[PDB]
Point group: C3
Chain length 456, copies 3
């Protein structure tokens, strides 16, 4: 035979359940093959890739990753691709797991305002990436045109308590990481495989803080994990936990009891986790500068009873989660909007600075600015700061070392430079400091920082 | 014992069958261990890495990848490496799967005009990369000095209908992708792992168009897949199909039913495919900018009956294959030769432009230049073009957006910049357009494009 | 239950055995669960990353990688992290394999002069990376803050003759590869994943020459292999041998009989090797420019009887090991110290040049400078050199091609440029040549080379 030889479609056609990340459609829960009608529409739209940073995404179903598709092995799928009339570009679809030329791309070419259709049998069980395959293919994928399709085995997957949808992608902005405004696609960075962001589910903080995934102690969690690329291979890892199982695509091999696993560009895996201890468990790309400098972190938050026999210790997770430990960074979004409108207040800056100060400065100066006597000097009521508040701009951008004295105490240490911070970020952080802990007040502007950055 | 303990060589020595890519030597078809004499010669030679782009390759047996070697586990191999007297460099060989220092490299050091020999027992069954290991090793490998050796299990591999040889490599030219002429090796790009080309079998289009691999519906195909590197890891994938099996080197684990698989730098795998539906099936490195911007695409073309129950849809594959959908791009080769000779005609430019227009422009403007009314403006008999044919150079290089009117119709859309196109490519494409569809004619030269590219 | 449900700790607390690379603590050799007290101290210190190149490493226990920790699955581990008072930075620890938030990082935040403690049960058997997780996490890891923890299965691992500890890392210096002096961390290179060094065990030559690992023909060797990253994925490979087994972390799957294996950033594997033939077996990252241009090579040296039936050939391994074939390159270290002190002699330069000449020049000009008549011209008593010893600086930096005559013999070949050599390296190499083989003598200085490099 062929694989997936389960008989002809039976019953009425089914109009398929699509879901937006991070949710999954329900199990199909049937024992017969069906004709499944899938309707998916392309929408090109601006969304926030980071706080105060807009990007023109190209999407399947209005999200990155695109809508999740769920069918049964042996189903006949009638696929309808619509391209919204607001689109500027033509689009198509290639579904991994399809048996046929281009995985559909050859038959789904769709101009703005049009619709295409093609039909395929799902022979191949597994989790599979789908993506646009319109020239230039790389640009389409880089702009967010990918998602997952699950083809269930005929008996269905084993029951779990939660199923989630998480997809990594690499993104290429003309501006640098966290540079505000509408950021165009940068073809030069893309060709060179030098992304400015590496993200889960299309944005920094998409799955952190108040947007974390949830489960309880004792529960099992399945995550359908994709890597849309376009270019990067993920050293996919869960901090502080282990995967009971990892299965790639439709593969017969299943790895068990691993914590770090390589997902190819265009690859997908199903992972399973059992919650044992409460807290935040972090999904990262363990090519570590991606996770901690470019946005590649997502959270699964577990609630329930402690188990001190398994893990007994403090819970100070801002030291690595940094500015993503908090529920959100909406103050940054708001300050950026106000700056664009020309209505930025001191308090707007202060609250944005407060959000950014977490991790970035607090790891050494503490959340209250007290420092640690003799080791990290205070920012709280700092005579050194007050003596020349402007010099703080140079200190942040270019670091500080050597002997200094602060609130009558000697320091001889090293503060690394932080030149990667953008002008608004430095301004906002310093404005927060100046207006906290009985410091002199005032404000620093982005334009002030720009001038200091530019001196030799 | 050791592994491969099958007895002493029997019979007469065998003088081994070497083959050029993409073919494989026949199965050894024997039940006893032999002494196998291998003779392989290094040749340094210019070949075309892309149409009109020459490169000085360093080769084992005159090809990239080098000649395929096939032996049986337990054989004693007497290896003779010759370095042709025309070579400028010394060379040697390291065969993965050899048990001994340097995999042979230590004993096969061979100056131009000389020959070396060493003997090894093939203890280890599997598919293995071989490559040069002469300082600087990276430069030798980057210049094309790698291939595969198969060491069969004693009972032989299972019968299939076709066996093919495909090897990925990353290449480092001083010039940019598709910049014409003889391109030197670029050490700086190589150290930084920033290749200009990523190719199967040593050239763009080596396995596309009229050079595709072939099979029929129902047939099984084994591909011996290598990654010579030097630096890249391939997210190796078949578009529109699945691998029945993937086996790395001589490993005991075999993965089944996967579509995307990671091949390490210096790694090799045996994959198996069963043809089910007619059409072109694309082998790519799914770090997508490699596949679609740097040459990393190869084709397996399947002929036979349609199976509409499995796949039913149109077959417009130029939308992703682009300029590699056609049998070849020989017009580009020819135009480049003519340009070098100072005998480039308008028609030379037109035919080269026609080849490059596929995908690159046709995805939006159509193959006939008609566009799509209101969405993509026409190039065919375009008043906007005719009004200022020179401005077309800026449109290609730097894009166009905003309200415009063309053949009495309003457009308000976005044409992305295409700055990665080389000066000759832009010139040739525009010359094609000007001389097609009752457009005004004339020509654009590479020197014209160069001037426009250089303005602020 | 949970996994690792073996009963409560019994007996007295055990104060755990830590070891420095490349050694491993002994097998725990017990059949009951224990309370294990681990004491690990962070020390920030300058060490030599390469000969004459210093770097400020941040370390767990004074080494890179950090001290190896060995416990039994089911143990309760009381972990004490001390941060030495000389440290400038705060630090913490995340142990992969820990079940709990941050793998401990959340509870081990430790300022200079302080100590922290947290307790965890080792539920998960396997080899696991541990690393610092203090913001900015990437900088901490890049500076060398990683190591391995082994959690044994309850019955212990199978007996082998040797166990070794090898950990890859990528490093980011402001200066270029082999540029002398104290090299700061370079954040820009790190974010871009463009390392200047890629090393085993924290330094070039850490495991080469007289620092190689050892075993004998017939013996089995287990290596606990880590990849600390921060960013790179290793195409981990043994030259001239094969791995009997490769097992990732605590995974249930075990691959057998492979030579090349991908280790994720933050990943760890246990590999097993059986010595069959004498010689040097090279562990590399087979992204080849890492192994041969950035330091990613380590040696296992096997002593014992030859087996000519398995491998019969010469042993000229300087052709690929290059300057790492010799016991060390201490002459380079010494010349650099002398240069810094202003006491650099001609002989200091000569001996440093001699060390660097191996591979770099000897592959073509031979170890004795004789060249090969008609193919590679002589450096020994070279009239061409003597005629204009200064022009040798341009020859090394920028190459030489075309017809030339040397000791009354015609050459028409190509010497590639070697611009990646640093000014001191070129100076020292040429000083060696001038003072060898009855050449005219004199010296070339680094400042001379600097001037020539800077001309147009
Ligand atoms: C890794 C530790 C660390 C981080 C992170 C850090 N600092 Fe510092 N900072 C120091 C140390 C140590 C000094 C003292 C340097 C010396 O001894 O020369 C210092 C000095 C200062 C000073 C001048 C002395 C004083 O107390 O007024 C200012 C202002 C300052 N830091 C602000 C910041 C701000 C704002 C941030 C975040 C953008 C930040 N620092 C991040 C460690 C750090
Ligand atoms: C992704 C879609 C797309 C691709 C690919 C594309 N174009 Fe365009 N092109 C457009 C659109 C849309 C416009 C109109 C822009 C506007 O509305 O401001 C345009 C405008 C033009 C115009 C001016 C208007 C006219 O009709 O004369 C020329 C000339 C042109 N394109 C040529 C090319 C050539 C040649 C190529 C390939 C090198 C190309 N274009 C590739 C979409 C595209
Ligand atoms: C890959 C081969 C190769 C390597 C490696 C190499 N050379 Fe050469 N070298 C040549 C060849 C061939 C020529 C002659 C070029 C010609 O024919 O135009 C040459 C020429 C020379 C000459 C001038 C002719 C003479 O004999 O005096 C000098 C000096 C020289 N090399 C020094 C060096 C030094 C020092 C190194 C290492 C830093 C080095 N070369 C590395 C091959 C090499
Ligand atoms: O556990 N590493 O981020
Ligand atoms: O199926 N991806 O090119
Ligand atoms: O065997 N490769 O270096
Ligand atoms: Cu698209
Ligand atoms: Cu794909
Ligand atoms: Cu070679
Ligand atoms: Cu190799
Ligand atoms: Cu640290
Ligand atoms: Cu980690």
């Amino acid at each position: 035979k062929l694989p997936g030889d389960f008989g002809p479609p039976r019953g009425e056609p089914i109009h398929a359940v699509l879901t937006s990340p991070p949710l999954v459609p329900p199990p199909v829960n049937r024992t017969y093959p069906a004709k499944v009608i899938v309707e998916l529409e392309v929408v090109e739209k601006e969304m926030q890739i980071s706080e105060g940073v807009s990007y023109t995404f190209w999407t399947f179903g209005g999200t990155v990753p695109g809508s999740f598709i769920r069918v049964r092995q042996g189903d006949t799928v009638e696929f309808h691709l619509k391209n919204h009339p607001s689109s500027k570009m033509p689009h198509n679809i290639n579904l991994h797991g399809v048996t046929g030329p281009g995985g559909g791309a050859a038959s789904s070419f769709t101009a703005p305002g049009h619709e295409s259709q093609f039909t395929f049998k799902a022979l191949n069980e597994g989790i599979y990436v789908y993506h646009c395959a319109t020239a230039p293919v790389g640009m389409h994928i880089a702009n967010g045109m990918y998602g997952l399709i699950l083809v269930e085995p005929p008996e269905g997957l084993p029951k779990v308590d939660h199923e989630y949808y998480v997809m990594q992608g690499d993104f290429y902005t003309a501006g640098k990481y966290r540079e505000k405004g509408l950021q165009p696609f940068d073809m030069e960075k893309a060709i060179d495989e030098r992304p400015s962001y590496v993200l889960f589910n299309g944005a920094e903080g998409a799955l952190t803080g108040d947007k974390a995934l949830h489960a309880k102690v004792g529960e099992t969690v399945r995550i359908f994990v994709g890597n849309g690329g376009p270019n990067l291979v993920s050293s996919f890892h869960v901090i502080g936990a282990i995967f009971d199982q990892v299965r790639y695509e439709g593969g017969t091999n299943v790895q068990k009891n691993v914590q770090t696993t390589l997902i190819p560009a265009g690859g997908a895996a199903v992972v399973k986790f059992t919650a044992r201890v409460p807290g935040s468990y972090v999904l990262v790309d363990h090519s570590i500068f991606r996770a901690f400098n470019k946005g590649a972190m997502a959270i699964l938050k577990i609630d329930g009873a402690e188990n001190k026999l398994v893990y007994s210790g403090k819970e100070l997770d801002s030291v690595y989660l940094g500015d993503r430990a908090a529920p959100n960074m909406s103050a940054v979004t708001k300050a950026t909007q106000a700056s664009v409108s020309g209505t930025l207040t001191v308090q707007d800056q202060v609250q944005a600075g407060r959000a950014l100060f977490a991790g970035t400065c607090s790891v050494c100066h503490q959340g209250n600015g007290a420092g640690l006597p003799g080791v990290f000097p205070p920012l709280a009521k700092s005579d050194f700061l007050a003596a020349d508040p402007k010099r703080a701009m140079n200190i942040v951008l270019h670091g500080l070392n050597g002997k200094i004295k602060v609130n009558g105490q000697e320091y001889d240490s090293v503060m690394p430079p932080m030149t990667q911070l953008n002008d608004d970020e430095v301004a906002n952080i310093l404005t927060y400091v100046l207006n906290s802990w009985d410091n002199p007040g005032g404000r620093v502007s982005a334009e002030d920082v720009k001038k200091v950055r530019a001196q030799p």
